[PDB]
């Protein structure tokens, strides 16, 4: 409905104005190409960082939001019907400013959680853990309103570009930060709390061989390469060391780490190019 | 060669028609872009999910097939010569329907092996483990007929898009399912049986530190859980399940469940303020 | 500026002439697309493998180099200003043939370090560990001279394409080989010596929960899945086995590996297709 696109675009413009200045910029950053939904959602959520200086008006918001919605409608129709597409888009449109506020808190969590994060522009423009969450919070609305096929395709699109695999059904709290992220897998029935931090190669997955994925409390940190598997619960304030294999419930305020250290035992160019 | 292209085109048309109903669809999906060989192979193997409804005639199949093989022929020539390129292409065309039947079984394996896979359409359009096998089964025929350079480049292309790293020399049986797949690495001389399932971050690789076998051979019905590292010229029997994060460096007999010996150990023990910092 | 671009172009052309037999090629390969900076750096460093035969004159080199330089300059200007952008561009130009020498040594390291590496052509066109180092050696110059935002952006672009995550601040010696590479993460303050070899899913990272990343010596090999965390040192000639969790220093001339083997215990298409349809 044209009326919903227009109402949502004005709500978005209001959201831009009440932004903290940290989320603003007078600069004109270079073009970022990726794929359609991400390019558009980036522009819609944070135009200052992804658009030409002259294309940051209400009409540009309306055009971009309309391109996004029409593409989403055509895809949901291809897998399902017009009736379901409309229901999904309506829900998405009503949720868009809420999504935008959630993505801002993800960005805040990245700046807080990463010593290498120097500014919000760096995080917004280049942190893949942020871009996966821009797409996931949109895809999750679609999934929850009955579209499980396009929402999965959407997540597989961002999966391809970041190496981060999050199912559209995953339920994720606020201030969620994935650092680096390549190899991260989070399954359909997983539940994640607030202020969680997750590193590369972490799996929140099903047992190797209904609810079949982990639930994670608040303020949980999961170190690189940990594999957290099965319908289990990690309590709040848990820290999980790198490469742990975790298949059991873990109580709150715990620290989990591989038990023991490994074993240690002791002990030009022309030549190399002469051999080929 | 045109006569071979026409027969393969006609055999593919016949293959489409004998498909089970589950592989067919009357719908018009949005176009999917990636890179040339993947887009073309997708349209060649499953037109119903990747092409405009008015581009599904024998001639459209022949156009897509011709463009694919002739891009392959031009790349192989660049590394080698026209004779080897023709040889590789001929083998690929003659195996093309065989490849299609194998990919269909990979799709079946994905559907049975994944509680989140709800339809064949979803699997066909979006599962990276299926897309990597579309490429790998093509590349492997090229490699086996002598083109080791372009078949590797081809595999690195699909690597760049899926994060799944499979060598063109890898020998892989039917009904093979990779779930999630990022970080998967499978080496040149590895051999994989039938009905295997492999998860993210799995290596079937060489020992960290000719006709050699330096990568693993795994049997049928093997499941390898996330993060497992299976290294060296070792054999994993059929019906073996390997738990997550395992480090395997020895042969494993059939009918074994393998897992890390010990659980990890375990010991006990806003925006406003945050926004004040980057503002100032 | 125009004259430094011309002298850098002539030094590059001479560097092409100086190459060993093995880095040359009479054949013409199909173009490779990715993203702008990688396409240009590939063509500038190895024209024989990435450009048409008729686009290898001095002016062709000068146009490719200028396109790159002007793209980087505007990108840095966008995050900072003309003053810093020129400082970085000047530094990069003065070091361009040095970077080319280092990348050739990375290629040599890949050939000697990988049995699947059959030829330099294959390595130059297709090895993602080489492509990430083409970018990183450029991005490191930019980072060292004050541009920490665009050099990060650059590294994230090559990250999307390879799944290899190397910070622009990382300091890396010569003959560096990443095999496979997906899931490799190397942090901002890490230091890597010469002739090191790193596999997929390796982290040289900070503690999960100034310098906070590891220093690695010469001839270190780190197997797949190893996590090396914190401001620790791995001495030279160390071999680190797959999936190791390293949180303490390792002296030189050591082999490190998980000490215990895993425990073990014993124990129709048509029908499936009817199920869902």
TrEMBL record, chain A:
InterPro entries: Hexapep, LbH_SAT, Ser_AcTrfase_N_sf, Serine_acetyltransferase, Trimer_LpxA-like_sf
GO molecular function: serine O-acetyltransferase activity
EC numbers: 2.3.1.30
GO biological process, one term: amino acid biosynthetic process
Keywords, alphabetical: Acyltransferase, Amino-acid biosynthesis, Transferase
Pfam families: Hexapep
Similarity-based family: Belongs to the transferase hexapeptide repeat family.
Name of protein: serine O-acetyltransferase
Originating organism: Entamoeba histolytica HM-3:IMSS
Organism classification: Eukaryota, Amoebozoa, Evosea, Archamoebae, Mastigamoebida
From TrEMBL, chain B:
Keywords for this protein: Acyltransferase, Amino-acid biosynthesis, Transferase
EC number of this enzyme: 2.3.1.30
Pfam families listed in its UniProt record: Hexapep (PF00132)
Protein family (similarity comment): Belongs to the transferase hexapeptide repeat family.
GO MF assignments: serine O-acetyltransferase activity
InterPro entries (UniProt xref): Hexapep (IPR001451), LbH_SAT (IPR045304), Ser_AcTrfase_N_sf (IPR042122), Serine_acetyltransferase (IPR053376), Trimer_LpxA-like_sf (IPR011004)
GO biological process, any: amino acid biosynthetic process
NCBIfam families found in the cross-reference section: EPS_EpsC
Protein name (record): serine O-acetyltransferase
Classification via PANTHER family: SERINE ACETYLTRANSFERASE
């Amino acid at each position: 409905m044209s009326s919903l696109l227009q109402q949502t675009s004005q709500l978005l413009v209001q959201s831009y104005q009440s932004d903290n200045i940290a989320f603003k910029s007078t600069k004109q950053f270079p073009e970022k190409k990726s794929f359609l939904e991400l390019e558009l959602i980036q522009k819609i959520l944070f135009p200052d960082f992804f658009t030409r200086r002259d294309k940051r008006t209400f009409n540009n918001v309306l055009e971009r939001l309309s391109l996004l919605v029409y593409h989403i409608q055509n895809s949901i129709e291809a897998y399902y019907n017009q009736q379901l597409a409309e229901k999904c888009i309506t829900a998405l449109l009503s949720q868009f400013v809420t999504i935008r506020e959630l993505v801002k808190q993800d960005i805040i969590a990245a700046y807080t959680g990463d010593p290498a994060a120097s500014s919000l522009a760096m995080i917004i423009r280049s942190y893949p853990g942020i871009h996966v969450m821009m797409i996931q919070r949109v895809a999750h609305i679609l999934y929850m309103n009955g579209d499980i096929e396009y929402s999965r395709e959407l997540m597989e699109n961002i999966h391809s570009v970041t190496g981060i695999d999050i199912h559209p059904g995953t339920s994720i709290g606020n201030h969620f930060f994935i650092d680096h992220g390549v190899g991260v897998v989070i399954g359909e029935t997983a539940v994640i709390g607030n202020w969680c931090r997750v590193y590369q190669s972490v799996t929140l997955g099903a047992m190797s061989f209904n609810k079949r994925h982990p639930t994670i409390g608040d303020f949980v940190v999961i170190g690189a390469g940990a594999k957290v598997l099965g319908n289990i619960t990690i309590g709040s304030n848990v820290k999980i060391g790198a490469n742990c294999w975790i298949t059991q419930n873990i109580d709150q305020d715990q620290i989990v780490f591989i038990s023991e250290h490994p074993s240690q035992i002791t002990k030009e160019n022309l030549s190399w190019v002469n051999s080929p």
